Structure formats: C-alpha cells, structure tokens
C-alpha cells in the first residue's frame, strides 16, 4: 500500500503534463498480480441477446461491485460497456458541406447538464415565499434524441 502511494504521488506530478485525451479516458495505478486468480463467465442460453447486450449487462450491473470486492486488484473485460455510437458517412457529410469537427461541437452543445440555480434563491429578498429548483438543459437519453440533434 505504501508503495502504491509512493508511485501514485509521482504519477500525480506527471498527470498535468499528459494529454487530455489520456487524462479523461482515465489513468489507473494498481497493486495487482500478474496472472488471473479466476475468470468469470456469462452466457445467454436461449440466444435471446447478442454479445454486446451482454457485455453491457456485465459491465453495467456487476463489474463495479466485483471491482469493489476487497482483495480484487484488477478486473479485465472480455467485452465492453455501452456507448452512444455515432458512425459518420464521409459522403453524406461532404454533401452538406460539414466536418467531423462540426459533429463534435454540436454534440458537445446540444447534450449537457447545466448549473441552473433556484427560484427564491439564497440570499433572497424579504418575505419571499417560494423555493424551487431550476432545471435547464439535461443530458440525452435515447438514440433518437441523438438522431434529432440539430
């Protein structure tokens, strides 16, 4: 544990001089083994769901607890969690005279959470009688809302 601490307190002086891509994709520092103590499997017998559906159930319902189980160093995913996958057409893009870059900025823009504030906020004016939250732009939820992105 102290070794882990000593390594990571140099990792932390290295961090700001790293790419933002690496930095937000996440850096991990761990005391692990070298080989697998064990490999847990999940299958679907009745073929009802595809591989990715599954990889998603595993990553979205289990892997966070199994990685919090005391004494477990690293977990490795055979599969992957879900993502919003946006698969660009180079032609259909060139058609409308647009770049990937525009997609990037767009999605950053129409999809976010916003610090909004409060009616009857603190510090209010005398006798105010209502206190309630302002809910502004909210993160997206369906695939469609992503299709409808302007």
Using CB under 8 A as the binding rule, whether residue 77 contacts a copy of itself is answered as: no
Q: Is 130 one of the binding residues for a copy of itself (CB under 8 A)?
A: yes
Tell me how far, at minimum, the Cβ of 79 lies from a copy of itself, in Å. 13
Q: Does 23 bind a copy of itself (CB under 8 A)?
A: yes
Name the residue among 57, 31, 35, 33 with its Cα closest to residue 44: 57
Shortest CB 3 distance to a copy of itself, Å: 9
Among 66, 88, 98, 104, binds a copy of itself (CB under 8 A): 66
Asked if 33 is part of the footprint of a copy of itself (rule: CB under 8 A), the reply reads no
Position 83 contacts a copy of itself (CB under 8 A)? no
CB-based contact 56:78 (threshold 8 Å): no
Size of the site for a copy of itself (CB under 8 A): 88
Q: In Å, how far are 35, 36, 41, 51, 68 from 80, measured between CA atoms? A: 21, 19, 14, 9, 19
- 113 makes contact with a copy of itself (CB under 8 A): yes
Alpha-carbon distance 16 to 48, whole Å?
Answer: 46
- Using CB under 8 A, which of 89, 97, 125, 147 touches a copy of itself? 125
Rg, C-alpha atoms of the chain: 23
When asked if residue 75 is in the footprint of a copy of itself (CB under 8 A), the reply is: yes
**Which one of residues 115, 142, 144, 147 is an interface residue with a copy of itself (CB under 8 A)?**
115
Lookup result for tokens 């700001």? 16
| Beta-carbon count within 10 A of 58 CB | 19
Cα 82 from chain centroid (whole Å): 9
């Amino acid at each position: 544990d102290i070794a882990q601490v000593q390594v990571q307190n140099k990792l932390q002086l290295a961090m700001p001089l790293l790419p933002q891509e690496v930095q937000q994709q996440g850096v991990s520092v761990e005391k692990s083994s070298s080989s697998f103590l064990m490999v847990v499997g999940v299958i679907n017998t009745d073929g009802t769901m595809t591989q990715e559906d599954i990889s998603d159930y595993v990553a979205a319902n289990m892997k966070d607890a199994i990685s919090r189980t005391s004494g477990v160093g690293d977990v490795q995913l055979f599969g992957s969690q879900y993502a919003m996958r946006i698969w660009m057409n180079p032609n259909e893009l060139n058609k409308f005279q647009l770049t990937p870059v525009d997609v990037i900025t767009a999605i950053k823009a129409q999809n976010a959470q916003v610090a909004a504030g409060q009616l009857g906020g603190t510090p209010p004016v005398k006798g105010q009688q209502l206190n309630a939250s302002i809910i502004a732009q909210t993160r997206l939820t369906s695939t469609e809302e992503f299709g409808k992105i302007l």
